[PDB]
Amino acid sequence: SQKHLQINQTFEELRLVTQDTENELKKLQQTQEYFIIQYQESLRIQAQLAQLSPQERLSRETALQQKQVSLEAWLQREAQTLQQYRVELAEKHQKTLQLLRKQQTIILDDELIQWKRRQQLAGNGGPPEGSLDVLQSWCEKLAEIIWQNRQQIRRAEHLCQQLPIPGPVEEMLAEVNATITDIISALVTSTFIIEKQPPQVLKTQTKFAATVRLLVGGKLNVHMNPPQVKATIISEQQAKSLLKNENTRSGEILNNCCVMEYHQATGTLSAHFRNMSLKRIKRSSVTEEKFTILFESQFSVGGNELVFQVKTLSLPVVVIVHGSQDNNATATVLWDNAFAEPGRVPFAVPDKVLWPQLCEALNMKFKAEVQSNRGLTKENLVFLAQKLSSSHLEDYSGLSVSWSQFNNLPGRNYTFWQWFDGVMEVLKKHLKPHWNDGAILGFVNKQQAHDLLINKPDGTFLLRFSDSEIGGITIAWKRMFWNLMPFTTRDFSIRSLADRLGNYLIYVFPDRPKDEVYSKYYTP
């Protein structure tokens, strides 16, 4: 990529200028030592007093003062140049930190946000986030560069303070040393990211896993004394108040908190959470209130001087006491993961969303749950729109759907999302390859399937989703069409749809014989 090349070239450029500055600092150190050892001779000659005899006394005193004025010129003539060297060095340091601020903002506020958005979208079966072993190298190099610069600034300040030529150096060194602290604090607080999220909607008293990382921890000696991270859970209100610096030392109780291990090869410092559990929750619609898992730690960098308390918020989660509440709550989660604004307060979401983005997210999670590449075609989306009217997708191109109208009761005990997720479940458990084989209609309705089997020969099939039961399917036949009572999930768990079809009906979905579609799925 062009941006990758740009930022890598910028990284190598920063490394080059930092090595330049290190060379200049070493030269300044050796030069100051030379200046001190040459200065010692000024005191050596300022005592060569003796009181021998008036003639030689006056002659030698005049000669000594004539040498002393030349020494007082030579010195301070070299010292002014030393001060100029130091000022130029401080200017180089300041320019380096300006470039550092630019590059760090580019890394954090642009690329990490992209990775986190990819994570949110993979939450609903989008493209996977991607390995952290590309941002890891960038962050490690950032940390190395800023640490070398802080070290150079510190040693330059100490070496200039032992020979304190006042000048303007003290101001510039109260400054840009003022800026390195902001840079390193932003970095250490912003590289505590969640690698593998804790699962969205999760039931109590069930084990779940989550893994966090410290990106820059590989080089900053925090792995020497590895800090342990603790995981808590807080409702949306406490999560909002926390970012507002409202000190509140809530939500529910976890069962585990653990230390961060280190991979010596990839140089990654990470905390795995493999046996976490939620045993008690303090709730204030149960399937709609969102919680978040906060991970927090505290550690030190270098000596005992630099301490950092760091915290990170995991993506919103919904607690589900009884298992039967699962299917609904996921909707809420998806909605957040579908429409999270960039700079929004924790779990703030726009009540009404456009239809195209809605069917986009629906197709995404559908291709996710079915584990197939069939997805929602244009006619299927048109049918879904007609369920929630005219039969052109261009008509629904500018309509808006509220959350209340999404997950209501369109015409029965359903709610549109619940029916969609029910068909998702029924073909995710028993009808994955049958959906991938092009055998389930998916966009067939009453009197829409009937007109598709009148001009066709006898015995043809069509498997649509039943609009009487939630997770069931209805078939077709051959004068009039012959439906049936819905095939409940149980009716598949006892004899799947592949063997239930095994005699009178021979064709599916015009000409394709029943065997050529289901011969590889009968019980031998």
Residue numbers in the entry: 138 to 185, 189 to 389, 393 to 427, 434 to 537, 541 to 559, 562 to 632, 638 to 661, 664 to 685
What does the paper say about this structure?
The activated STAT dimer translocates to the nucleus, initiating transcription of target genes and altering chromatin involved in loop formation in enhancer-promoter landscapes. The canonical domains of the STAT family are all present with the coiled-coil domain (CCD, S138-T331), DNA-binding domain (DBD, F332-V470), linker domain (H471-D591), and SH2 domain (Q592-P685). Archetypical STAT-type SH2 domains are comprised of an anti-parallel β-sheet created by three β-strands (conventionally labeled βB-βD) surrounded by three α-helices (αA, αB’, and αB), which are also observed in STAT5B.
With these domain boundaries, human STAT5B was crystallized and diffracted to 3.29 Å resolution. The overall architecture of human STAT5B is analogous to mouse STAT5A with a rmsd of 1.21 Å, and a rmsd of 1.89 Å and 2.03 Å, in comparison to mouse STAT3 and human STAT1 respectively. Within these domain boundaries, there are 29 amino acid differences between human STAT5B and mouse STAT5A, which are predominantly located within disordered regions and the SH2 domain. Conventional phospho-peptide binding occurs perpendicular to the central β-sheet with the phospho-Tyr accessing the N-terminal (pY) pocket on one face of the β-sheet and the flanking residues occupying the C-terminal (pY + 3) cavity on the opposite face. The hydrophobic pY + 3 cavity serves as the peptide selectivity pocket and is predominantly formed by the βD strand and αB helix. As such, the surface-exposed βD strand controls access to both the phosphate-coordinating βB5 position and the selectivity residues located deeper in each of the N- and C- terminal pockets. The SH2 domain is a hot-spot for several mutations with the most prevalent mutations occurring either on the βD strand (such as N642H) or in close proximity ( < 5 Å apart), suggesting a common mechanism of action.
